[PDB]
Amino acid sequence: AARFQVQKHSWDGLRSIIHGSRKAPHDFQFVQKSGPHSHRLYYLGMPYRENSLLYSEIPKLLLSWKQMLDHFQATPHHGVYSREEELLRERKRLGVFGITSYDFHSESGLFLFQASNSLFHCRDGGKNGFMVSPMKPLEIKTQCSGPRMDPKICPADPAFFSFINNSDLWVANIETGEERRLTFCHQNVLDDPKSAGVATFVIQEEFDRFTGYWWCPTASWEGLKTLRILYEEVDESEVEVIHVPSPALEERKTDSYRYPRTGSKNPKIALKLAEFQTDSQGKIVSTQEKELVQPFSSLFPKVEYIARAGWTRDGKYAWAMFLDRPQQWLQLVLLPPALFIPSTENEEQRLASARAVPRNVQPYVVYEEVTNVWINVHDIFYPFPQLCFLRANECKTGFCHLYKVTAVLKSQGYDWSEPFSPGEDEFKCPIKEEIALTSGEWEVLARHGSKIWVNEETKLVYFQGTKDTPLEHHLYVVSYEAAGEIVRLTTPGFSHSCSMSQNFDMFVSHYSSVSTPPCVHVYKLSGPDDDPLHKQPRFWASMMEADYVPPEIFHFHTRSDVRLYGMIYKPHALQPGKKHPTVLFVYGGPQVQLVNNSFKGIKYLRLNTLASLGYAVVVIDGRGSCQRGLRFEGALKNQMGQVEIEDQVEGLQFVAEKYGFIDLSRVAIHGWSYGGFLSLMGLIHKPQVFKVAIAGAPVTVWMAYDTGYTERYMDVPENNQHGYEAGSVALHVEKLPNEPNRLLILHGFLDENVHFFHTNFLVSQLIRAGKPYQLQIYPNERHSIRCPESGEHYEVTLLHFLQEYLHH
Amino acid sequence: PAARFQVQKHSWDGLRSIIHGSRKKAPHDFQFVQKTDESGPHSHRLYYLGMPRENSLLYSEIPKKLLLSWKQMLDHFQATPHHGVYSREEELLRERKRLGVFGITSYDFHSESGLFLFQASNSLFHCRDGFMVSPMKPLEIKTQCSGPRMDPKICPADPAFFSFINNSDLWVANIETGEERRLTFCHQVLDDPKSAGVATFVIQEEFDRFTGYWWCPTASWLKTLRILYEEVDESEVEVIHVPSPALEERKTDSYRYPRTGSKNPKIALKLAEFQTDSQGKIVSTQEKELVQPFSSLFPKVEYIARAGWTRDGKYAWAMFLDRPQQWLQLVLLPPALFIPSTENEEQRLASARAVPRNVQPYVVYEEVTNVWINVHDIFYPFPQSEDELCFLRANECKTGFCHLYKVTAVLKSQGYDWSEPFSPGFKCPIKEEIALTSGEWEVLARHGSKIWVNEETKLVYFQGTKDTPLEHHLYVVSYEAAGEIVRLTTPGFSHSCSMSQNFDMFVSHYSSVSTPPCVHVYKLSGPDDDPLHKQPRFWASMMEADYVPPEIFHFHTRSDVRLYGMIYKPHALQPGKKHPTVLFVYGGPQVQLVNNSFKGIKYLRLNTLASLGYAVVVIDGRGSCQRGLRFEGALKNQMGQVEIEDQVEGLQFVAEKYGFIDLSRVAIHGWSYGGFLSLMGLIHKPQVFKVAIAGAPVTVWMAYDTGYTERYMDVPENNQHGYEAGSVALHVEKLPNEPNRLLILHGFLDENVHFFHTNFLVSQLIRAGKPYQLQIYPNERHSIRCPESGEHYEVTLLHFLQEYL
Numbered sequence A: 001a002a003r004f005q006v007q008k009h010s011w012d013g014l015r016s017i018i019h020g021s022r023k024a025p026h027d028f029q030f031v032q033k034s035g036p037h038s039h040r041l042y043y044l045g046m047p048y049r050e051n052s053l054l055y056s057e058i059p060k061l062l063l064s065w066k067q068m069l070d071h072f073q074a075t076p077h078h079g080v081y082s083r084e085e086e087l088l089r090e091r092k093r094l095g096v097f098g099i100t101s102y103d104f105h106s107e108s109g110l111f112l113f114q115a116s117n118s119l120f121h122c123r124d125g126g127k128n129g130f131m132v133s134p135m136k137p138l139e140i141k142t143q144c145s146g147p148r149m150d151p152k153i154c155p156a157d158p159a160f161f162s163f164i165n166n167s168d169l170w171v172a173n174i175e176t177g178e179e180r181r182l183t184f185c186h187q188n189v190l191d192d193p194k195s196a197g198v199a200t201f202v203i204q205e206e207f208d209r210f211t212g213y214w215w216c217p218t219a220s221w222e223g224l225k226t227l228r229i230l231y232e233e234v235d236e237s238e239v240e241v242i243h244v245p246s247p248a249l250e251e252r253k254t255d256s257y258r259y260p261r262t263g264s265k266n267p268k269i270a271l272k273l274a275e276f277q278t279d280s281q282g283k284i285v286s287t288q289e290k291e292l293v294q295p296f297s298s299l300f301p302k303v304e305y306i307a308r309a310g311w312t313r314d315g316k317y318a319w320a321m322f323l324d325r326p327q328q329w330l331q332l333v334l335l336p337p338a339l340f341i342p343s344t345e346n347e348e349q350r351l352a353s354a355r356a357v358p359r360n361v362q363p364y365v366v367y368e369e370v371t372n373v374w375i376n377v378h379d380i381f382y383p384f385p386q387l388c389f390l391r392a393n394e395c396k397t398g399f400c401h402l403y404k405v406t407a408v409l410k411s412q413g414y415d416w417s418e419p420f421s422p423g424e425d426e427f428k429c430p431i432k433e434e435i436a437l438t439s440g441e442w443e444v445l446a447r448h449g450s451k452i453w454v455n456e457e458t459k460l461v462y463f464q465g466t467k468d469t470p471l472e473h474h475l476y477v478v479s480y481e482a483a484g485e486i487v488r489l490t491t492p493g494f495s496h497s498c499s500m501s502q503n504f505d506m507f508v509s510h511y512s513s514v515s516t517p518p519c520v521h522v523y524k525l526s527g528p529d530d531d532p533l534h535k536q537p538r539f540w541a542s543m544m545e546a547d548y549v550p551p552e553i554f555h556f557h558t559r560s561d562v563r564l565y566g567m568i569y570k571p572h573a574l575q576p577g578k579k580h581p582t583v584l585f586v587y588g589g590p591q592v593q594l595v596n597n598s599f600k601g602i603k604y605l606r607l608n609t610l611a612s613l614g615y616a617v618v619v620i621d622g623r624g625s626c627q628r629g630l631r632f633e634g635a636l637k638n639q640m641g642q643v644e645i646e647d648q649v650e651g652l653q654f655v656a657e658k659y660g661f662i663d664l665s666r667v668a669i670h671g672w673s674y675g676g677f678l679s680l681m682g683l684i685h686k687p688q689v690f691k692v693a694i695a696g697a698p699v700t701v702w703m704a705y706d707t708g709y710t711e712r713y714m715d716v717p718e719n720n721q722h723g724y725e726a727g728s729v730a731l732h733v734e735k736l737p738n739e740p741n742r743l744l745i746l747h748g749f750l751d752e753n754v755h756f757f758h759t760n761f762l763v764s765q766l767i768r769a770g771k772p773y774q775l776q777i778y779p780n781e782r783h784s785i786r787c788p789e790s791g792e793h794y795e796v797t798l799l800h801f802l803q804e805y806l807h808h
Numbered sequence B: 001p002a003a004r005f006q007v008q009k010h011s012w013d014g015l016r017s018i019i020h021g022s023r024k025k026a027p028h029d030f031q032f033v034q035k036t037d038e039s040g041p042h043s044h045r046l047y048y049l050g051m052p053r054e055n056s057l058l059y060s061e062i063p064k065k066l067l068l069s070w071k072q073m074l075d076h077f078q079a080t081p082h083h084g085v086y087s088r089e090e091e092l093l094r095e096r097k098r099l100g101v102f103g104i105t106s107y108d109f110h111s112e113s114g115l116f117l118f119q120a121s122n123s124l125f126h127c128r129d130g131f132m133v134s135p136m137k138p139l140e141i142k143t144q145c146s147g148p149r150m151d152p153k154i155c156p157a158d159p160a161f162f163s164f165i166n167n168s169d170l171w172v173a174n175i176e177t178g179e180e181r182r183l184t185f186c187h188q189v190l191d192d193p194k195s196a197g198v199a200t201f202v203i204q205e206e207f208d209r210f211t212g213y214w215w216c217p218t219a220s221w222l223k224t225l226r227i228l229y230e231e232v233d234e235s236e237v238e239v240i241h242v243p244s245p246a247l248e249e250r251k252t253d254s255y256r257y258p259r260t261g262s263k264n265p266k267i268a269l270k271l272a273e274f275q276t277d278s279q280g281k282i283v284s285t286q287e288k289e290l291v292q293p294f295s296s297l298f299p300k301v302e303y304i305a306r307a308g309w310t311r312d313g314k315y316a317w318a319m320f321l322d323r324p325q326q327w328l329q330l331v332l333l334p335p336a337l338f339i340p341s342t343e344n345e346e347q348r349l350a351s352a353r354a355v356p357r358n359v360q361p362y363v364v365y366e367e368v369t370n371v372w373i374n375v376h377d378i379f380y381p382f383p384q385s386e387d388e389l390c391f392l393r394a395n396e397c398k399t400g401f402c403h404l405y406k407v408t409a410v411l412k413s414q415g416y417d418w419s420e421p422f423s424p425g426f427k428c429p430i431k432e433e434i435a436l437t438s439g440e441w442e443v444l445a446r447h448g449s450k451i452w453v454n455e456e457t458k459l460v461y462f463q464g465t466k467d468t469p470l471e472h473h474l475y476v477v478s479y480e481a482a483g484e485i486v487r488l489t490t491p492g493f494s495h496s497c498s499m500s501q502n503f504d505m506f507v508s509h510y511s512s513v514s515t516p517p518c519v520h521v522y523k524l525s526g527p528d529d530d531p532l533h534k535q536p537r538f539w540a541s542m543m544e545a546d547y548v549p550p551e552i553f554h555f556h557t558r559s560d561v562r563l564y565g566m567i568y569k570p571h572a573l574q575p576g577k578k579h580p581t582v583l584f585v586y587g588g589p590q591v592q593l594v595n596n597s598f599k600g601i602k603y604l605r606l607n608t609l610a611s612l613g614y615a616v617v618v619i620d621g622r623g624s625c626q627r628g629l630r631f632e633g634a635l636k637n638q639m640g641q642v643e644i645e646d647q648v649e650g651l652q653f654v655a656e657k658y659g660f661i662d663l664s665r666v667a668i669h670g671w672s673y674g675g676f677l678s679l680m681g682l683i684h685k686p687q688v689f690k691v692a693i694a695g696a697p698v699t700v701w702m703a704y705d706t707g708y709t710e711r712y713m714d715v716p717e718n719n720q721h722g723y724e725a726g727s728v729a730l731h732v733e734k735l736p737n738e739p740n741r742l743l744i745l746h747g748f749l750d751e752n753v754h755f756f757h758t759n760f761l762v763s764q765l766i767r768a769g770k771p772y773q774l775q776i777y778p779n780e781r782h783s784i785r786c787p788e789s790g791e792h793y794e795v796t797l798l799h800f801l802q803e804y805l
């Protein structure tokens, strides 16, 4: 007997093992100042209790985290956020209490942020003066009833700010205390589907747009001072309703949600302007709804989702990213303000203001990305003033790179009075030039809050990328004038998450590795101004510094001739010759890479606990995995739960050969979300390989998941019958084991993303087919698991399931 | 040692095939009809419901001079909707009756015209029965109404007419002409909180009332026809969301569910009148309300338990209950007391002044208790002959055991000024109150048990436990002379009987522990001058019939109270061996599991447990039914606290008497109240019960309804000790830290005991760091209807005991 057996602990024993195991700066703002301190870094951070507004003093060495707010409890009673704010917190996966974000205006020193019920503000820097003690944070009153969501200061005038209240755009004035509503879409459950300024469910969940309104950066002076706001109008009437249990479990009630199924209708959408004029006293004189001369649905037919939007820096154009329903055709459009006429009741009136719109004014479709895989929504779009602009683009080569583009704004001339339906490419601009600023078998980061910082003086664009290796994020500088020598600025051996000064003199880097915890360091760009590309990142100061054996990154190749990366958590105190029981950790879906060179000890602590007890833990980024360019991701197209398991097994057999200690007779597939889907999919296809499976929040019916995600990867149901049925674990329950203790199902009862239905439908089908199952519900938890108590029970149940049942 | 019996360990495949091997409705709802032919071969025709598939309308012939043929009334016909799926109001009415049988569950019948009316298919149907021989096509009744037509009833005064609820309003129609008139206007969910003719949730779930209107038996001469009905308003009653059966649709349904301590609905009695002419057309209609408001006349009344009319049509009647369910009264309501309802207070006051001073509410009977009022069906008004009112009434409160009393109350007209509003706080004098039955036993009056009163012979036939609590028997006693009670059904068996209107025959659905049921038709024969002593002679039979019956036993407790039990022996027992034991439990009020009737249909899984060598013990402890109010009252305000002692007491007695109980391997298990006591067993007696498999448990009494919880446990404001003491969710710290000791089973669609109870239990288990196993039933409410689920339920149960006991 050369097989290693784990110590079988009692339940109190396992509880103490988990309890024993469990016993950073972000959102930076560089403001320059002559005393000892050159800059001030404002930021959000959580010291050794809750997240809050902090600052450090950059001198001329570890920086102190100075408190900016005075004895301020930003989090509510216990931590009970409002119904909308906690869903806003689930969409961003914000699992920290306190001030999650803040708006800032660098000229005035105005900070604006949510906390408890109301909004708050405090003034610091510039014309007010720098505090050297915690400031009293001032409340802003309202006579709006409910919560005030999505605060943003007016860029053109710091006296004004905006917010959503009851699904409508509001505008207020900090100084005078005045409020004014601008949209009137919302008056009710089904009875009020109308909404303005909001990003609807799918847009938040699947497209990562959490706002639906955009201030104009500049103010015009017609004929008073006018301030415009671009905003998405939304109409969720024909979108199917679904009921999900309230966290008020004692109430025994649910919430209506406009949840689009794959195939079913997405909300009807439009962009609208909201103007308003002000005087010297700062009072709102007049307000106006404006809409597009022709309807949004006819100017841009076959457009389903507004991915992104904003303005140009001059305010001469609003813009948006448009997507088609299959998400294979993206467009960038300029919408000039003169194309918007005041929304009016009368047929006689609506043509008068239409006639008044110039023939020269039109929508100019600047850029258009096309593919056979799918469009990923890349954030990067920097228009220069006058059209020249920087854009990220993956479709062209198959890898996300920066291009510089010049578009020709030639006015064809249009009869805006008489009703107009366009041809195929009616608005496409001539692309004058398109320069490849970056190129290669690697990617520029443009999603999940990655961004470029463009310095106009030097003609350099700063960006993050995988140029050295997929395992590491790094900061790179390149010229957009001359696409030439890219210079790496972050030191190798680590993965960096950086943020730049607006002056381009300092920068912060939050960085880590597999073997080392995270650090947050401030680096000064030094070197003469003769050649600005090649300024050395001089280490200036440190914000943060620094049982557990870390895992080892490794790599292998397939019979199809391609690199897949993996990770191994080595069994603690390993004897060569002994073979250990193996927990294969899984996710395997798109938008995720688990195998990279960064510290895993915080989020994936349980994997090291597993390791501490004797388990081999293996992670494999198979085809579909993120960071490897479009074709690598595209391997899943209309075949989810098919390609993934075969390279999960390939990575496990490889691990058996490279390392000495795997027992392939005792392997356990486990993952949450997509991982749970794959766990269930592993036990269907490879029961010979996987003795047990712990599947958590799986999708069992693809039909029951939404438009945005599903249709991007698996097409519409009517177009992909085979793939929907092949990849839906609930329709293949006949192929789950007849042996009990081989499948443990986990699901959150409040899960608003992947609904409990999937499990409820899997069990329904398991019972029908006559199949044993174990199940664990989390009654107070949604897609993730926030409450510690719940988390501990999960981990204790995990160790007990593997202990008793992953055997022989 | 080798004394411990170890059950054969089977694979999950093995268990499924054992369970599959296990599984491999009787006549009811009788109607006697005399043939009216002196020279013909048949004396009677029995009409009834039954199976071969679907529960369809059948009939048998009773010859004058032996199995009877089950003749079908309908021409093939399909009563069940395709794939066996009913609408909302049909399915949630079947759950309240626990109707788990396909097809026609009930019919109305009119014995003058031979007119049958029944809710079949997704509509209404009718047929007439000269007397047919071969089947007939039942005619579908047309309608322009949108939704389901619920609660169909023939108008007793005129078989041309009938009624139904439609969108929670009362409608009247005519099977001859086809004309349809709506009578009430309460409705157009949440937005529509009013309703008329409808029995609300708690009225159905906890009070055994399903109809909310009552035809007047006579018509007064055009001719007019009255209908009594409960007008109801659920605005102030809390709303809760329960998952629809359309799981694929992922929507809940809103119920009006009054949790304990919350408001019940505002209620009232109202009349609905409509005149007709010689050609059958409805001429006019009229809403009518009580001349004084309902809440001022009969204050402190919370639930309308039962209602109807006297046979003459003179007085309507109702049984009223107070919120703590300790005070019941039977009120007479003459039609005179109700006036045309109008918004014009001057037009209404013209009607108010018009109602005479003599007309009045007469509170006839009244029942006071310090335990609780159980709602009993039996109330028979005799016809008023020779200002006063004689009637028969069942009454548990007087002695503590339910017995028939003949009562005469004085209806002395007081005199009231109905025009000017007043507020009292009607009590009739009782002229006499004779006990017709007495003793330490009981007359059956809940759950559709009834008397049959023959006025020609002055006798009252009834169902009771006079001989033994283990058997229901048919008795006859005179109501003139409270004398000799003669038994008509033979001992050894429990019986479910039903009488002829001419009192010459009866059917008896009867059975025993040892023997499967039979439905036998008997004839009452003997001299007519001595009617009490008719010998019941066997006339004919309509039905006859791996199993091993249990044996009933009794033991006494430390307090000297006699508790009955059942035990299933392990099959092919070897004296010496000590077997692992499954204590099957219910333990709540309103149920008796231990009696002398067949168990093998409903409780086959207990024999299946026995077939694999498990001991199965069942004990009816204090709080259980059929033994009078004292015995039930042992629970009052102490649920979860008394029950397990008797259960453990019966379990120790069982290990003594029978030599085969290994007390080291006892598993407690039950559904509903049973699963609650299973959890309470694992908390209070963990040394005694190694595992608990608890199904559909109430884990927070504070979350269960008004009707049930308040009756036994009081309002939470008055009993915070007992609520907390008996809520298993608050005592989770005391549950085991060892895994494999607690399996939780619950129906996801449960609209009675909500899945919340399980949900909230797991929450508290997770907080305490306690292990559990769980199984959901996605397409199941409180009971497990679907075969596949039940099989899965049984395979889990066996595997769980096998692995972990």
Ligand SMILES: N[C@@H](CC(=O)N1CCN(C(c2ccc(F)cc2)c2ccc(F)cc2)CC1)C(=O)N1Cc2ccccc2C1
Pocket (backbone or CB within 6 Å): A092, A093, A205, A206, A448, A589, A590, A591, A592, A673, A674, A677, A697, A698, A699, A709, A753, A754
């Ligand atoms: N719409 C997607 C979204 C998705 O697939 N993702 C996982 C979450 N993820 C963020 C994250 C949040 C919280 C946390 F703890 C970790 C990651 C993230 C990732 C990288 C990063 F830098 C910052 C945040 C983004 C990608 C979905 O909900 N499902 C769940 C699910 C379940 C079954 C089948 C398909 C899908 C598809």
Ligand SMILES: N[C@@H](CC(=O)N1CCN(C(c2ccc(F)cc2)c2ccc(F)cc2)CC1)C(=O)N1Cc2ccccc2C1
Pocket (backbone or CB within 6 Å): B097, B098, B205, B206, B447, B588, B589, B590, B591, B672, B673, B674, B676, B696, B697, B698, B708, B752, B753, B783
């Ligand atoms: N309101 C009570 C009502 C009750 O206690 N009863 C159950 C229904 N029962 C009928 C029945 C039908 C079919 C079947 F399969 C089982 C029972 C029955 C029994 C005998 C008979 F002749 C005719 C019908 C009558 C009594 C309740 O449900 N809970 C559920 C529950 C669960 C936990 C705690 C308290 C309670 C309170």
